[PDB]
Amino acid sequence: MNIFEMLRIDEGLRLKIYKDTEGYYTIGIGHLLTKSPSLNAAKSELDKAIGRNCNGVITKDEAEKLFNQDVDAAVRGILRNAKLKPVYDSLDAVRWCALINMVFQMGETGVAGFTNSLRMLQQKRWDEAAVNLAKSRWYNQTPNRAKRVITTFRTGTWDAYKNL
């Protein structure tokens, strides 16, 4: 499948503000609004993002617009970041989706911090990287999704997304 299809599986779709799997205010297809524990901070960011007074609720089309922007931002983040780009140069089409997925979920800075796992990926040590990634807080917080993403890195196939 493509990265959009993969992320729509992992993120689902919600039209009202919710808390993501990391505890942060979010909306639509995993659109992070703020890391601040402040609901008002989230609402103000939402209205800014959409361009109107949303009162914490958006439409489907607004959600998909944000989604496209967010996948774009994740791809661009991998390319700009000196710690992520070299990894990308070692990843095939399927494995790149796994990296984009991570950057979409945790952000460019967060993923760039996975120093050892990134090196293993860069060196095409797929099984080693898979074992290492499973030791992370990320895995412990969202094991189902992390397992899928890790299998994608490990195998370079879509096996983990085939029947969900």
| By CB under 5 A, residue 92 contacts Cl ion | yes
Distance CA 119, CA 53 (A): 44
| By CB under 5 A, residue 93 contacts Cl ion | yes
Using CB under 5 A, which of the segments 16-24, 69-77, 86-94, 133-141 binds Cl ion?
86-94
Residues 72, 79: contact at Cβ < 8 Å? no
Q: How far is the CB of 144 from Cl ion (least distance, A)?
A: 26
Distance CA 137, CA 127 (A): 19
Q: How far is the CB of 90 from Cl ion (least distance, A)?
A: 12
Residue keyed to tokens 């659109």: 31
Task: For residue 36, say whether it is annotated as part of any ligand binding site.
Answer: no
What would the two tokens of residue 42 be?
Answer: 């989230």
Annotated catalytic residue 5:
no
Annotated catalytic residue 20:
yes
Q: 3-class SS at 71?
A: helix
Interface residues toward Cl ion, by CB under 5 A:
92-93
Catalytic center residues? 11, 20
